[PDB]
Design a protein around this nucleic acid. Structure first.
Ligand SMILES: [Mg+2]
Ligand SMILES: [Mg+2]
Ligand SMILES: [Mg+2]
Ligand SMILES: [Mg+2]
Ligand SMILES: [Mg+2]
Ligand SMILES: [Mg+2]
Ligand SMILES: [Mg+2]
Ligand SMILES: [Mg+2]
Ligand SMILES: [Mg+2]
Ligand SMILES: [Mg+2]
Ligand SMILES: [Mg+2]
Lengths: 134, 149, 77, 116
RNA sequence: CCAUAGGUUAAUGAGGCGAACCGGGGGAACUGAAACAUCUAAGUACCCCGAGGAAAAGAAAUCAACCGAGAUUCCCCCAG
RNA sequence: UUGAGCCUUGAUGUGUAGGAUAGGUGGGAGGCUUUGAAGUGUGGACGCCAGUCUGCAUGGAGCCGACCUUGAAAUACCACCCUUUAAUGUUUGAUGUUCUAACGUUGACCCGUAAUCCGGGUUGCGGACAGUGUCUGGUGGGUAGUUUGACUGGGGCGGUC
RNA sequence: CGCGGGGUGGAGCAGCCUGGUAGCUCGUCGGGCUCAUAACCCGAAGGUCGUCGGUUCAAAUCCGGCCCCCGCAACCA
RNA sequence: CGCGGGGUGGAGCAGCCUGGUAGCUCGUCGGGCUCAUAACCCGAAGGUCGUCGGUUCAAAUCCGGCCCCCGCAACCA
């Protein structure tokens, strides 16, 4: 299954660990090892019912450092996805981006959303290792 | 529990381990047999410095005496012929009581607790292997020949 | 009697309140059980009649510590 | 599926129905198929053809086991007994030996008096 | 084996009775509710154990109220 | 042995348009390969038996993305995950067998002891069962406490309130 | 009073749970049947998912109610 | 005297609770089968719903009187 690249991508990053916000932003340079400049999409598993129309989280947020405002809406299963710009934007730039989105989701809290909202927020680049934040 | 050992328990311990065991196992087996002693503040100190340096290894050479116990008898064979019946078929069946008496006066001065009978109670006339327990881990394999007297 | 040696527990009484709250006198007995203990001092077995709680007391305290308490209370052990 | 190499194909051919059970060499059953479970219910259940299609549906269900060759143990008078072995050969098996295990007492229990 | 259990002897004390009161261990029912089952009667009657001249309790892991009072016991209020 | 939750990791998912035993979504177009390649021998796993998956290796270093047919793009690379499922780790649970130390012993023998009680001691048989305490569902006239109306051309019966 | 659900040709049951593509068994004809009746066997006829909205390429299914059949545990005005 | 049920083609019984439409088996009538009858197969007819009145759009049914039948009751001195 896995080879040279795909394995080292996972060996560098501690899989069984959710990092601090100022931690994950720096470590991503280790992973993006393609010819081009990749980008990091944000994975946020909302604690709402995708089987309930009354709780759909839908909106758009401004990226402080661009890609550059993005648009977003979750799946039919619970998690929402959107990018926060190029991988080559400096670490604290993404820090600026990520935090801006988290607020933006809590900015769009459903009334019938019963339960823990985020529970796990992760980001990863084009060829990125699964890295969840705190 | 939290009972600190004194011996080589066959599943969890290795002389000096603070293993948590069930209360019944410690109170009825480990305590009265000296396989372990309750880990209460003061008792821990008597073991870690006094026993862990000297007395621990003293019991280990006693296990070396158990290695000595494997060959107290030279030939390692005990032949007992008691009244029986025809075609083999022993009259009164022998037991671990008498085998403890048989080897003591003829070699290994063993007690009844270290005597075993891995194959019945020896009703047959012939070859038998009374596997002595000189130690819990290392045994003996003395061949006993019961002949129809 | 059903009086424990160690804890000094005894059969207390009490009501047996049903669903209709009908009071009825019952009697709570201690969980006595004749266990045999090993005293490292005398290197023998001392048979006490202890409750289940009284065994967890002998577990924490010393076995001889408890007998020292029973000797002070003039009990035969 | 366990993949057994060889087995025994019992044939219970009674007057009304033929149950064909393919077991291993140790008697443990691997699969079966009756003449009344493959359609042919009633009058046609006691025919040598129903006994044939019985053994046919028993060849499969044991394909998962892969029994190459097998011994045969027939039992009972029946309408089958000889039409079932032909189909059990046409399925693709190598008949080791054909034995007859019809149970016959040496005048043991008293038989019924029936059928006037 | 030792040693314990047990056995023998001496010394000190205890045992029983007593009117109530007192502490503790058990603990009813008739009755009232216009019937009765929760409840009341009542922790009363009564039984048992223990003690004294009194006994009990008792020197706060108590109240109060953000001001303070300072163990327990008993009486009048508080308040039917 | 065998259930269940979970972790890591690996598979899994052919309406139909169809080069695809493709689920939704989704960042981005180079990964890939000589930290020993396409194609294949042959076997296993999987299987709606349509086509995947794959160990070693003769072979020997290539293989392929948007392109075009989709409601969707290419597990080339990666992320969050859903049904289906594999090995392991961990977590408790329910069974089966064995063991002996708890416990039982109204088995044997010995002593206290001239004593079928009892206690202790050897020993045999059972054995974490049995039995006992607290909680708990069922059964329960064996037992206890009680209720079972009034009017009425006497009461009951009928009827009425 | 909830918490579970279950509702499908005449009708008992599937398939739903894990999205597109409704099978099954009796109740009726044509027969074949045979000197005949019986029985047997062959092919046919019949619900677009109890009802209404949302999401979606596509809803029998997933999410909301309505009408129930219930399965009980409750049940001290 | 009281309580409760019933009365439906020639026979025995459904339908009545929850009003508008009355059905099953036997028998009868006609045909066929057989040498003829019984059995068997095919077709059809046949009911003032005890009786009188009332309620109502409509009464076998809902209500009331009477006649007949059935069971229960007709008790304590
Ligand atoms: Mg008969
Ligand atoms: Mg006195
Ligand atoms: Mg009263
Ligand atoms: Mg005095
Ligand atoms: Mg005092
Ligand atoms: Mg005091
Ligand atoms: Mg102060
Ligand atoms: Mg009574
Ligand atoms: Mg009373
Ligand atoms: Mg009256
Ligand atoms: Mg005729």
């Amino acid at each position: 299954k896995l080879t040279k690249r795909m394995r080292v991508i996972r060996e560098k990053v501690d899989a069984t660990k959710q990092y601090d916000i100022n931690e994950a932003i720096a470590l991503l340079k280790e992973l993006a090892t393609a010819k081009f400049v990749e980008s990091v999409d944000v994975a946020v598993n909302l604690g709402i019912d995708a089987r309930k129309s009354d709780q759909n989280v839908r909106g758009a947020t401004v990226l402080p450092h661009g890609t550059g405002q993005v648009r977003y809406r979750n799946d039919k299963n619970g998690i929402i996805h959107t990018t926060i710009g190029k991988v080559d934007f400096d670490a604290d730039k993404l820090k600026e981006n990520l935090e801006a989105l988290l607020v933006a989701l809590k900015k769009a809290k459903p009334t019938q959303a019963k339960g823990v909202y985020i529970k796990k927020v992760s980001i990863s680049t084009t060829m990125g290792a699964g890295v969840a934040v705190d | 529990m939290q009972v600190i050992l004194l011996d080589k328990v066959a599943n969890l311990g290795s002389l000096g381990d603070q293993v948590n065991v069930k209360a019944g196992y410690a109170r009825n087996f480990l305590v009265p047999q000296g396989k372990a002693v309750p880990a209460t503040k003061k008792n821990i100190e008597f073991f870690e410095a006094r026993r862990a340096e000297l007395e621990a290894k003293l019991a280990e050479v006693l296990a070396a005496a158990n290695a000595r116990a494997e060959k107290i008898n030279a030939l390692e064979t005990v032949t007992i012929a008691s009244k029986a019946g025809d075609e083999g078929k022993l009259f009164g069946s022998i037991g671990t009581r008498d085998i403890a008496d048989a080897v003591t006066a003829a070699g290994v001065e063993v007690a009844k607790s270290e005597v075993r009978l891995p194959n019945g109670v020896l009703r047959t006339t012939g070859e038998h292997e009374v596997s002595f327990q000189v130690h819990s881990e290392v045994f003996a394999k003395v061949i006993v020949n019961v002949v129809a007297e | 009697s059903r009086v424990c040696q160690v804890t000094g527990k005894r059969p207390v009484t009490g009501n047996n309140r049903s669903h209709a709250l009908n009071a009825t006198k019952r009697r709570f007995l201690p969980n006595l059980h004749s266990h045999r203990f090993w005293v490292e001092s005398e290197k023998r077995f001392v048979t006490l009649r202890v409750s289940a709680k009284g065994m967890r007391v002998i577990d924490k305290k010393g076995i001889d510590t408890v007998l020292a308490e029973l000797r002070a209370r003039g009990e035969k052990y | 599926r366990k993949q057994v190499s060889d087995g025994v194909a019992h044939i219970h051919a009674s007057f009304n129905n033929t149950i064909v059970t393919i077991t291993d060499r140790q008697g443990n059953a691997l699969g079966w198929a009756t003449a009344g479970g493959s359609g042919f219910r009633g009058s046609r259940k006691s025919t040598p053809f129903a006994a044939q299609v019985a053994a046919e549906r028993c060849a499969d269900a044991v394909k998962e086991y892969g029994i190459k060759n097998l011994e045969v143990m027939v039992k009972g008078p029946g309408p089958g007994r000889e039409s079932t072995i032909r189909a059990l050969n046409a399925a693709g098996f190598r008949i080791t030996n054909i034995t007859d295990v019809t149970p016959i007492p040496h005048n043991g229990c008293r038989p019924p008096k029936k059928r006037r």
